[PDB]
Amino acid sequence: HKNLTTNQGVPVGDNQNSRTAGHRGPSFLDDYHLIEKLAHFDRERIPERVVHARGAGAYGVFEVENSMEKHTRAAFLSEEGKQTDVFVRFSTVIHPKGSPETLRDPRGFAVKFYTEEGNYDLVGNNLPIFFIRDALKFPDMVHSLKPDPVTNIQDPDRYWDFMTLTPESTHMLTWLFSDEGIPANYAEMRGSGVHTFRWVNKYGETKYVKYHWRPSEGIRNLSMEEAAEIQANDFQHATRDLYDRIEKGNYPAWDLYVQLMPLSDYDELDYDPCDPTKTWSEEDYPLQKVGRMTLNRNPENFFAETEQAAFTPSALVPGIEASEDKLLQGRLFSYPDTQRHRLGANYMRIPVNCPYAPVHNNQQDGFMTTTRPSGHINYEPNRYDDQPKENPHYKESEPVLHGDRMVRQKIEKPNDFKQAGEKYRSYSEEEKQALIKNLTADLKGVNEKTKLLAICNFYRADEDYGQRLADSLGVDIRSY
Amino acid sequence: HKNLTTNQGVPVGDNQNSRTAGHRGPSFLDDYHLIEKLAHFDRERIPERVVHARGAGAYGVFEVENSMEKHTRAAFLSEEGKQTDVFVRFSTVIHPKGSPETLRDPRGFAVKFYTEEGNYDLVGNNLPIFFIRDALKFPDMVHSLKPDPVTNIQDPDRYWDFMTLTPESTHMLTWLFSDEGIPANYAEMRGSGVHTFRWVNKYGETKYVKYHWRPSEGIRNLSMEEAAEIQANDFQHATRDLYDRIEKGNYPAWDLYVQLMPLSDYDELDYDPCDPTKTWSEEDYPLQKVGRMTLNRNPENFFAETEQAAFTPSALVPGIEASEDKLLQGRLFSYPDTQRHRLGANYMRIPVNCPYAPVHNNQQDGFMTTTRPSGHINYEPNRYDDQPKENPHYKESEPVLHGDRMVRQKIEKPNDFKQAGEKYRSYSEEEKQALIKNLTADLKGVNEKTKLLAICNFYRADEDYGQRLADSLGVDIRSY
Amino acid sequence: HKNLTTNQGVPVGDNQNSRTAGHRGPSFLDDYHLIEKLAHFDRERIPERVVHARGAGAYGVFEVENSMEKHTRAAFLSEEGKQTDVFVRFSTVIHPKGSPETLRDPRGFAVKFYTEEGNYDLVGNNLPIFFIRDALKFPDMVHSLKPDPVTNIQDPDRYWDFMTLTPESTHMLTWLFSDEGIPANYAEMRGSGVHTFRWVNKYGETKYVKYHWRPSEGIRNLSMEEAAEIQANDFQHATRDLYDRIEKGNYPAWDLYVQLMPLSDYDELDYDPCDPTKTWSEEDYPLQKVGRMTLNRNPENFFAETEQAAFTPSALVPGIEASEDKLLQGRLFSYPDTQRHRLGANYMRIPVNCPYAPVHNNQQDGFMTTTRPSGHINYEPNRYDDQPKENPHYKESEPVLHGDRMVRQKIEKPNDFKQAGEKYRSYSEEEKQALIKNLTADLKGVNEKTKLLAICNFYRADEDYGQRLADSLGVDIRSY
Amino acid sequence: HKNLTTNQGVPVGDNQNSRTAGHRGPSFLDDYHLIEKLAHFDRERIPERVVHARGAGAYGVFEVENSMEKHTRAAFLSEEGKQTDVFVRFSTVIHPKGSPETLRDPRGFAVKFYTEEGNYDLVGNNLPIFFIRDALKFPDMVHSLKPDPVTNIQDPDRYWDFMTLTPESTHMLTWLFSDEGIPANYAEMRGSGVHTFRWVNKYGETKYVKYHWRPSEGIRNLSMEEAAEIQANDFQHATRDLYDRIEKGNYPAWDLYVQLMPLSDYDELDYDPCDPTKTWSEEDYPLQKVGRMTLNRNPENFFAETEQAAFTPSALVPGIEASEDKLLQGRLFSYPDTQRHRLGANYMRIPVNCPYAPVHNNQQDGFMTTTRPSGHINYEPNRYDDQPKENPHYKESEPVLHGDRMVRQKIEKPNDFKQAGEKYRSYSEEEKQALIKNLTADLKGVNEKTKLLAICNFYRADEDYGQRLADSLGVDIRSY
Numbered sequence A, B, C, D: 001h002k003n004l005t006t007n008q009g010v011p012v013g014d015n016q017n018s019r020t021a022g023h024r025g026p027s028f029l030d031d032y033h034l035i036e037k038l039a040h041f042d043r044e045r046i047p048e049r050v051v052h053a054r055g056a057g058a059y060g061v062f063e064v065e066n067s068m069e070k071h072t073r074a075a076f077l078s079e080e081g082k083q084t085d086v087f088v089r090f091s092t093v094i095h096p097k098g099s100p101e102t103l104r105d106p107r108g109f110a111v112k113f114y115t116e117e118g119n120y121d122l123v124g125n126n127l128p129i130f131f132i133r134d135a136l137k138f139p140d141m142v143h144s145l146k147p148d149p150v151t152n153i154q155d156p157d158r159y160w161d162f163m164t165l166t167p168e169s170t171h172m173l174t175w176l177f178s179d180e181g182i183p184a185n186y187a188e189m190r191g192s193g194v195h196t197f198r199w200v201n202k203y204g205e206t207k208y209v210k211y212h213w214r215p216s217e218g219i220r221n222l223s224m225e226e227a228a229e230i231q232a233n234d235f236q237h238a239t240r241d242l243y244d245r246i247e248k249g250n251y252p253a254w255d256l257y258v259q260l261m262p263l264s265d266y267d268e269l270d271y272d273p274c275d276p277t278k279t280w281s282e283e284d285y286p287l288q289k290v291g292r293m294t295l296n297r298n299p300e301n302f303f304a305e306t307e308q309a310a311f312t313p314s315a316l317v318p319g320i321e322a323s324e325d326k327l328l329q330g331r332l333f334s335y336p337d338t339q340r341h342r343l344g345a346n347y348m349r350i351p352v353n354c355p356y357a358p359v360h361n362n363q364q365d366g367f368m369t370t371t372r373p374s375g376h377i378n379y380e381p382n383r384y385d386d387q388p389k390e391n392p393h394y395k396e397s398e399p400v401l402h403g404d405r406m407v408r409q410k411i412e413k414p415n416d417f418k419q420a421g422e423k424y425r426s427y428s429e430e431e432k433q434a435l436i437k438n439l440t441a442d443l444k445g446v447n448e449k450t451k452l453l454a455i456c457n458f459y460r461a462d463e464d465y466g467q468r469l470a471d472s473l474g475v476d477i478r479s480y
């Protein structure tokens, strides 16, 4: 038994009635409990994420099966059996917070590893490639996919306009308009790092690395029709499914694999290994098992933990570094940037975002300083040996630069169509029918010029792909 | 033909490629366009409304059919034929932005009238009563209805716990669990002021008033099955319908009616006429036609106009005043309070929120001061005859207080069950079946003790109502 | 010995050099330590207080000498010897954060008591009366005093315009333009509650109360010339003095006294006992000793504790209530209102602001939620006996209301001039000379019509007062 | 004659009295005017600048005397006689708003040129060099200078600890501790761009450039004693002086000169020409006159225009580019970053910040959207020829990179002491005495080890400089 109180810790005598002029009269300004309670209620909401607003979170554990010290000095990967706590958020992409989980979209797959050398965030998606290869385009791509800024409804004519004029999107669309565009839920879903990263070992040797998460529950997708049937009855079915699995002890898991590639393979390839519109062949760069992540604990409060969770591809740990991927390079900025706005300058003190490893630096102040700071010395260098100092054992590598000028220029060997064709041809007949069906439903109402350009991009990927789509849409492409 | 520019007005030479060390190298910090563009993208989102987050807006005109000058000095209602521009937002209540418009909920019906004596907001709902009668309870009610703070899913066990222990909710629930709980769209929908207000005429005489909006399009509601079928195909059908009707010239309209009641009628009624859980009998207080509102223009930008729209029940004009309704009283505070948070201190300068009537006062500064202020004199009284002065012609009335003391005390004559029973008995047999069906599907999984308490509250409203609900739920209530 | 780290807990390898293209080239975007460190730096500052921006804080202890249980049920005053921790901030009023502490102004004297029944804030000044008696005028008065909104310099012509047209200010100015307008430092300074409050005992009996703090260090004031001489070498002398006293173990202290007055004395007086322009005679309502406050500890971090400290007159505890003073009534609203803006919705979780008493309520979320919330139940009423409930033993009193209407109307018996005259006559000859000198230097450059109105207000207080000021200003008032 | 109104445009009947229970009773919640007026007052303040918080602004005109088209394509410099509007803000550095203008500090000299190709900000100081050469150190330097985080008083022992351990500061301190460390006012003051920039002409040819502003009023400084005498009577004398000059028609002016240096001169200088701790010889790189800036208009509102002014070194225009200077490189980021926090995401729409040149882009939304956006197309590429497109005539240059790796490494040829010695020897005997006097007063209380290190740095600049300082401080330097 407990008293209801104000935020001043005064017990509340009456949580039912406002203070008024007799039992029916107007209300008095001197009602601190009323005003305090309504003023806080009036301030509950913070801005949603600019993308991936709809999502759900869980905690778990990552365990190393095969130590990776030959290839990376990352502490959390250094010994067989080594266990690291994680927090994970899954998400959709485009629509706002309360939107259905049955819509077509990539799904977010964001893993925060609380390591002994700091927090490591691997901010992935289910699908292993992306629509674009330069961050400068991301607001455009997003604006095109987001609800129309006049009508508040998503319009295929808008995002197809952008995508068709951005033919590097052709590989991604070939995956997204398979039925994997609507995963059955967050458990029965692939995960991918997408980008090439650099792994650096204790000798300073570097490899390119790709990450892949393979669901213990298998991959399962929804057709458009199966999605509609779910949507009719539940607009948060994946959020429900994840919570429910974990509450009943049926913990979902994923095995982590990597691919590794020498830096010197750049010239051996007909695409850029750091173009995030490209996968690497599993035949040429085989998947190597690392370990397993199991999610086994729901959050205690959705807002405090899942809503306020902050992930960044720039939360890298010794041994793991960015590649030159221009898309990744902009993400390194944009995540902490948006989080300072969304969550406050001190968002890194919110519990879910706090490292397990110690934090000591000379940053200070900012909105909502809750950490009881102390001491006179908030600058370095200083004369005091006991104050925090830089540690040269933790310097990052020094990547070689091949360019001799500061330029704005597309990568060489963009190769926009070849992998899309390879993917298309890798589909079963049943999967090819689904892809054509889904693309046809999306493209049938768009501007004719845009519709033709889409067909041409897919035709350049594979002639059969393009021809089938043309026939399904009633578009005669004989004169080309 | 136009240049893309930065926010500094410098034309952009390349909107495709980040600035990099050669064609494929890492990105440079000196890329003002990349950073400016991403940093603004990163800051697009503001907090959604704490309730009524999902909604849609339109502009139009209100035209007076019958002058109301016998009863109110309100300027916009003074003359036959007098036209006042309006902005209107419609909304659901509980779920976030992006949520479906096929869910059970009251619907918001918020009208801003841009009058010659200032902006007048009538911030209504479709349904004419409310669940509670004191604002101190509003955060509780909302929290009970909102998705569970652990699971992020709405849970009937939670809101039925609250409602059943708040039996003044019984009349509201008797309307909301009719099929009017799911309006077909925003056009084919009732509107209501809900509260009693005070109308004050040129002689200073006051009457109680209620407001009603009657759709020219008639009322159409969705059964739970029809709502499911629409939810499957379109999560935003009401937003779509409203835009589309207006774009095709099929402008929706509502007639405005009032009921009027003498102050003195308090003492003779068996309920409090300022209890917003009560309606007034249309036999005893007949609807009187005032005018018609037609919505004929979509906004140019959904975020700037509909998202940023701010309404408050405290935006009253001369001739129209609050009543003593303890629910209304809290609303006077909470709306501009929340809006200062949600939108900024200067939210009243956002174009949709601006009055047509001139604004002159000694307020200053605050975030995002865009108005080019000038002058030395920002205080009153002052010696300058040309500076803004108070104007005694515009004083509000001086309501009589019946209370002796500052108290926290429930109103007399709460009468929580009688009108709910009257409503129930007014339903056709088909409508009583729908009610019971919709209640049954909501209650069937709730805690048994809460379930029984719901049944008892409805049984107190009407025996046949309560017994049918009990029969439908398999609950034997004969021992009580 | 400690590593410098990022906020992710990654040790920093180099805290000297940015990451660049070779040793002399431009900087890279992928420098997380640079960006994180600059971005936090860029966000250190929050808005200063709207008034009393310049100030200094200290902790200490309040110890009861004479229990007050006969007059108030306040827990912290219930027993001889009972000790309550305090946090105190002292301040100037008008100028910004870095402004000199040698300027004429009231001084703030804000005491937060961490009691067993919640935090109690007594938000006083040194001077025992105020310029104005209604909170509607506060923004006006402030705007007049503040630096001119064009020039950013304070202008006597502006605030004298306001003050002269607000003659209830005449008592306050008669104190403020004595040399007590510039206290020597914060230790050698009086403290006052200013307002009448209500004390309520365990029988529900109410008295009016005034609070007074008497410095153990005695009162010392600066002449204008002494203030200039300090200002020449130190613009933060009072902040220095306070820190330095406490660091040397020379702890300043104040004894707390109250005056007590029956509610029924209203009719015995020629002023309103709740008019904050008025003092109560010490002959007729003698000072009664309560206890002593000693300040004995400097804060650990000036931003986290002193800058982010939030006090509100509405932080009242059982046994202590507001009076009907219209000036106080507005303050009840304005402090927590400004603090939500200045500090965040969750400002009451900031350590200095936290109560020692337990906090349990159904409030939730808001920016920077750091408190690890949990549980499914965030609403009341609820069916769970272990969740927080209202406690009727802690209801506030029910003050009698004498008015029968909602009005906007000045108090009866404003009596604007009598106490100013009494104060003037109470001054020693030396003190009267300083008053006239100080007023003369302030008035000599103002508008002649305003100047004359000031002289007339002071003449109405006391003929000699007014005549001396007139002579000193070269104004001939023969003919009035 | 004008009515006082609410923000809703309703005329105010009484701007004196709150609404209350009779003439002396407590206040009612239904007082929209009171709560609106107090709530806006409660939100007047925004965060001050993190540095340069104290300052003053004015408008004027820049007129070209010698067209610079041989060296830069900058539009505003292209023709003799061409006039460009400016806004200028002058400032101190370390102390807050409200601090005196008689303190030692660099002075800010920030110039916004409203050019036909966009806004160009030259964000200078009076002194032509800086304490540090890498932006990574800036928060450390600032934190050491700023008031101690515990005491709120600036402590020489703190900043001398930093500066001594940062010996690249030696040249700066040699200027700052001359009497030019306290300019007499803002008009009688030098201006400097500080950094090397790059100028690029219409043929694509690049030169290094430095900017210098020479006051038509001459340079005049204050001794410590002359500063104290002013500080005694006016803590805003420079703000006053500026306003008063312009109001009286006595417009202050500065001639703009540049120094120009071939890129290839790097290799034969004994310093790095992009090290902002270094000046360029005026014998070897003579000052070349460009034009004249006259300040002739005070702002209409200090908050809206001077407080909310936003400058950034990254507001460059075609023809003017950053150099590789590692200090400048971080400024390019930090200014718009802090401004998004300080002012809002849409700070560039605040009138003083708006370009004269057209702004057209696909950015949208964000807090306080006041610009009436319209249109369906917010993404590029798109199919619409009339939507904003990139324009390749406005690409920036492609600087050659000399580095072959991503490194964190100090520049070659730091040469920390040579120019400090040259400056010392360039002082008159009178100026050397002032320098030693000013340094001695600053150093006399600092830690002995730090004090010695300071003496040693200045001794390395010039043996006489160091010996005199040692003698003045009573430090025996023999055993070194």
Ligand code: HEM
Pocket: A042, B048, B049, B050, B051, B052, B055, B089, B090, B091, B107, B108, B109, B110, B123, B124, B125, B130, B134, B135, B136, B138, B192, B193, B194, B195, B309, B310, B311, B327, B328, B330, B331, B334, B335, B338, B339, B342
């Ligand atoms: C004490 C009772 C209530 C409280 C405390 C309350 C509070 C709120 C709050 C804080 C908002 C968000 C406003 C914004 O950010 O702009 C809101 C929106 C709204 N409320 Fe209420 N509300 C109450 C009762 C009601 C009632 C009785 C109705 C109808 C009679 C209603 C209809 C609405 C509507 C339509 C909106 C959305 C306004 C818009 O379109 O922007 N509310 N309410």
Ligand code: HEM
Pocket: C042, D048, D049, D050, D051, D052, D055, D089, D090, D091, D107, D108, D109, D110, D123, D124, D125, D130, D134, D135, D136, D138, D192, D193, D194, D195, D309, D310, D311, D327, D328, D330, D331, D334, D335, D338, D339, D342
């Ligand atoms: C890395 C080094 C530096 C950093 C990180 C830095 C950062 C900042 C920041 C964050 C502000 C606040 C600006 C605002 O809120 O609008 C500022 C203001 C200012 N800085 Fe710097 N700064 C640096 C070096 C310099 C240099 C070298 C100069 C002169 C060359 C300078 C001149 C100014 C001026 C004049 C202002 C005030 C502009 C105004 O009037 O608002 N700063 N700086």
Ligand SMILES: Oc1cccc(O)c1
Pocket: A093, A094, A104, A105, A106, A145, A159, A176
């Ligand atoms: O993220 C996407 C992209 C394309 C279509 C779609 O429905 C969603």
Ligand SMILES: Oc1cccc(O)c1
Pocket: B093, B094, B104, B105, B106, B145, B159, B176
């Ligand atoms: O707003 C409401 C109230 C009750 C049930 C419901 O589904 C929605």
Ligand SMILES: Oc1cccc(O)c1
Pocket: C093, C094, C103, C104, C105, C106, C145, C159, C176
């Ligand atoms: O607070 C005040 C009031 C009047 C004069 C002054 O200098 C300060």
Ligand SMILES: Oc1cccc(O)c1
Pocket: D093, D094, D104, D105, D106, D145, D159, D176
């Ligand atoms: O900016 C500065 C630097 C050094 C001493 C000082 O008083 C101010």
Ligand SMILES: [Cl-]
Pocket: A340, A341, D340, D341
């Ligand atoms: Cl921000």
Ligand SMILES: [Cl-]
Pocket: A361, A362, A363, C037
């Ligand atoms: Cl740091």
Ligand SMILES: [Cl-]
Pocket: B361, B362, B363, D037
């Ligand atoms: Cl006002």
Ligand SMILES: [Cl-]
Pocket: B340, B341, C340, C341
């Ligand atoms: Cl706020």
Ligand SMILES: [Cl-]
Pocket: A037, C361, C362, C363
């Ligand atoms: Cl609560």
Ligand SMILES: [Cl-]
Pocket: B037, D361, D362, D363
């Ligand atoms: Cl853009």
Ligand code: NA
Pocket: A066, A067, A068, A080
């Ligand atoms: Na191993």
Ligand code: NA
Pocket: D066, D067, D068, D080
């Ligand atoms: Na020329």
